[PDB]
Subunit: 139 residues, 3 copies
């Protein structure tokens, strides 16, 4: 399997807090750790492919966001993980291969990829968490 | 005194220039050094607390933004300071403790924190200055 | 010649991709390498000067964006260059001097600076490219 970077980058951010939550400045995605229940939605990621009639659309996670077939948002200090599941909102079939999430069939797919909490993680340490995904194609 | 990070981060930015000022790209907060008079407003910082009925709301400045009971925006190269005063627009009572600005009474406060130039600093070197404040609670 | 930093910074970004292009997240400026033809427009840069009746308006490129009288966007890893020409949309006369693009006559100029591909570069490696320009004056 080989991923070819060819596209833009989408960044999913989430600030985890305690019950007493202090929002400073402009609105951003924030949740209390108590809200990090199994399958809790974190946010959608739009995907729009062009010129891929003969390639399999793919998204590659930053090195710090995957390890051992698993994906996760990572804290600013690179220490804490928030495991997630990545799933298209439609019925399309995809595969995971070492940090790469690719579509099973060729074509210029457009769609929404949902990012969901994988397993209850209500003990997550408060902090700023990020998941970075780069567009490209797999073969 | 102890601060518990629990909330989002607000960033106050200011570009200081000379009288001949060249604005490139999108509008941003910029002032000539001549405008850095005592009590000159730099910008507001919104604060919205939730779930803090039994905690004292607090904002903690980045390590590089405070020293010796004083707050300041810091240049990109970490060298130059622009001393400021931090004050809520309403009549609420707050206290400063080693980089932490906390509310005297418990409660889920919502309000505006003003950032003002502390003492005339019309000699400030031109550059990009930042003040970073993180939400949480104090005890 | 001497440039005095005095103003804000404008950042021109461009993501280069292959024909199969996967856009992830919010819209950003992206082009296939095949679109990097000679004189292809990359994007405009607004300039608004104030208080410069007796100074020559100038823009200085980041150190990593110029070398030997030539300007270029640079990849995230600092390795790959995309040579460009910088030109005002109006009929004003400007000069280039070691990374500095300055106006020939004094005055508080307001205008648009166009960034164009300099020579066909359809072999550019896919990646994220940036050109940073800071406002100030020259003498
Ligand atoms: O964000 C997700 N789900 C939500 C909240 O349930 C929602 O269903 C939704 C769907 C689609 C879009 N969109 O296309 O912009 C926004 C919000 C998940 Br996908 Br993680
Ligand atoms: O910015 C401040 N003051 C100004 C300019 O005087 C102003 O009064 C104002 C008040 C409130 C808001 N707001 O709630 O968004 C914006 C501008 C200071 Br506070 Br530093
Ligand atoms: O972007 C440029 N040119 C385009 C596309 O041709 C266009 O002419 C244009 C002109 C002016 C503005 N503007 O003032 O915001 C936007 C787009 C070039 Br300049 Br590189």
């Amino acid at each position: 399997g080989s991923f070819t970077p060819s596209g833009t980058t989408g960044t999913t951010k989430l600030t985890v807090t305690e019950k007493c939550q202090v929002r400073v400045g402009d609105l951003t995605v924030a949740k209390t750790r108590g809200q990090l229940t199994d399958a809790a939605p974190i946010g959608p990621v739009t995907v729009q492919a062009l010129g891929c009639d003969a390639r399999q659309v793919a998204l590659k996670a930053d090195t710090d966001n995957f390890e051992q077939g698993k994906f996760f948002l990572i804290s600013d200090n690179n220490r804490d993980k928030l495991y997630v599941n990545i799933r298209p909102t439609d019925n399309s079939a995809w595969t995971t291969d070492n940090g790469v999430f690719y579509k099973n069939d060729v074509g210029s797919w457009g769609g929404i990829i949902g990012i969901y909490v994988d397993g209850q993680q209500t003990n997550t340490p408060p902090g700023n968490y990020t998941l970075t995904l780069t567009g490209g194609y797999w073969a």
